[PDB]
C-alpha cells in the first residue's frame, strides 16, 4: 500500500475483493460498491485510493505492473539478445499470472491499450535511429499478440510449445525491429 | 442479400457473416499471391498484401463497422494464414513459426486498423512494409 498507518492493509483488502468481485461477474457488472462492501469498506474510500474503477481493475489484474517491472528490466544491457531477453521476461510475467485462475478468469473476461502504452515506455531508449518510435509500436504489437494467441486465444501449436522455443523464435522477430 | 447481411450486420449466421465480412476470401487471396516468388523479400511481400485487403476492407464504413462491432474472426484469419503460408516455412519448429507469422499478422491489423495504436494506424503502407516486414523474415528464414 504505502506510507500511511492502516494504509496498506486496506489497499491490500480492497485489492483482494475487486479480484473476488471481478472474476465473479466481469468489469462491467462489478460496482465499487461492492466491491466496498466485500472489503468492509465504502465507495468513498476505494475512489480515494484508486480514482476509477478502471484504475481498480488493472491494479487488481498485477499483469500491468508485472510488464512494466519485467521488460524495463530486460531492455537493459546490450542491444545484443535483447529482443529474446524481452520476449523471455514478457513469457515469464504471463506464465506467472496464468497459473492462477481469479486472475486468468478476468484476463479472459477482459487491458490491451494499458498494455502497449505499458510497453512503449517499457522500451523507452532501447530503439533508436529511424522511425524509433513506429518500430517501438511494432514491438509492442508482436508482445500483445504473442500474448493473446499463447495464453487466451490458445492458438497451437504456439499456446503448448516450451517457453524457451518461444523465445528463442519469436526473439529473433523482436530483434530484428530493434537493430532495423 | 450480402448487401442487406452488411447493414443489419447459404451456410449459417455466422457463413452469412464471413461471406458479406468480405475479409477473409480477401486475405486468402492476397496472402496465397504474396508467398510465390523467392524467400527472398517474402516478409515484405506478405505484410504488404496484408496490408492492402485491411486498406480496402477498412475503407467501407460498413464493412469497418461490421469489424469494429473479433475472435470467431480471429481464429478465422489465423486458418486461413497458417494454410497459405504453411507451405513455404520450411526448417526446424516451422509449424510454430508459420503461427507466429499469423500471430503477427493479425496482431498487425488488429492495432493499425480496429485500435488505432499510434503512430502504427498512421504510417504510411511502405514505411510500414518495409519494417514489420524485416520482423516477418526473421521468422520465416530462423
Avoid at 506464465?95 to 477482459?110: E, G, I, Q, Y
Avoid at 495464453?151 to 532495423?180: N, W
Wanted: aromatic fraction near 4%.
Amino acid at each position: 500500500g504505502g506510507r500511511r498507518p492502516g494504509e496498506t492493509r486496506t489497499r491490500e483488502a480492497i485489492l483482494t475483493a475487486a479480484r473476488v468481485c471481478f472474476a465473479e461477474r466481469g468489469f462491467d457488472a462489478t460496482s465499487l460498491r461492492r466491491i466496498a462492501e466485500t472489503a468492509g469498506v465504502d465507495q468513498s474510500l476505494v475512489h480515494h485510493f484508486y480514482g476509477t474503477k478502471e484504475n481498480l481493475f488493472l491494479q487488481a489484474l498485477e499483469l500491468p505492473g508485472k510488464i512494466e517491472e519485467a521488460i524495463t528490466a530486460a531492455a537493459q544491457g546490450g542491444l545484443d539478445g535483447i529482443g529474446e531477453r524481452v520476449v523471455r521476461a514478457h513469457l515469464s510475467v504471463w506464465d506467472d499470472v496464468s497459473s492462477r485462475p481469479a486472475l486468468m478468469t478476468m484476463v479472459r473476461s477482459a487491458l490491451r491499450e494499458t498494455a502497449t502504452g505499458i510497453l512503449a515506455r517499457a522500451l523507452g531508449g532501447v530503439i533508436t535511429g529511424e522511425d524509433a518510435m513506429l518500430r517501438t509500436s511494432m514491438v509492442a504489437t508482436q508482445l500483445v499478440g504473442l500474448a493473446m494467441m499463447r495464453y487466451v486465444a490458445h492458438l497451437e501449436p504456439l499456446a503448448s510449445a516450451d517457453t524457451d522455443t518461444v523465445a528463442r523464435h519469436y526473439g529473433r522477430a523482436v530483434q530484428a525491429i530493434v537493430t532495423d
